């Protein structure tokens, strides 16, 4: 019903921690716009090297700054479950999931 709406929890057993479910999709979707051959070639290198979700590779690479190596260092492992460090931690949204409530 479009009045109460009270589920339990929207989480898919695959990845832990937030910022790696919907955002990502949008992230890669947003990062896609701004891309270059250089970074691209690197991204591929990350996949070929590691082989992690491209999107993630694109994020990792970027997150790093644009270093396949640096990325790998992160991709391989990453932050040791850190509370807050690097990057701005803020939430945003226009409504909810990208696409859905449009018409019908």
Report how this structure was experimentally obtained: NMR
3-state SS track over 9-45: CCCCCCCCCCCCCHHHHHHHHHHHHCCCHHHHHHHHH
d(CA 102, CA 86): 36
* C-alpha separations of 82 from 47, 85, 86, 104 in Å: 25, 7, 10, 43
Both tokens assigned to 85: 């460090």
| 9 C-beta neighbours (distance < 10 Å), count | 4
Nearest to 45 by CA among 26, 30, 58: 58
Nearest to 98 by CA among 32, 34, 28, 22: 22
d(CA 46, CA 49): 5
d(CA 103, CA 82): 42
- Interior/surface letters 60-88, b for 16+ CB within 10 angstroms, e for the rest: bbbbbeeebeebbebbeeeeeeeeeeeee
39 in Cβ contact with 61 (< 8 Å): yes
């Amino acid at each position: 019903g479009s009045s109460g709406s009270s589920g339990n929890q929207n989480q898919t057993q695959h990845k832990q921690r937030p910022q790696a479910t919907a955002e990502q999709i949008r992230l890669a979707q947003m990062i896609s716009d701004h891309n270059d051959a250089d970074f691209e070639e690197k991204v591929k290198q990350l996949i070929d090297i590691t082989g992690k979700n491209q999107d993630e590779c694109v994020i990792a690479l970027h997150d790093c700054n644009g270093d396949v190596n640096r990325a790998i260092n992160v991709l391989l492992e990453g932050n040791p479950d850190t509370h807050s460090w690097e990057m701005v931690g803020k939430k945003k949204g226009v409504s909810g999931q990208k696409s859905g409530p449009s018409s019908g």
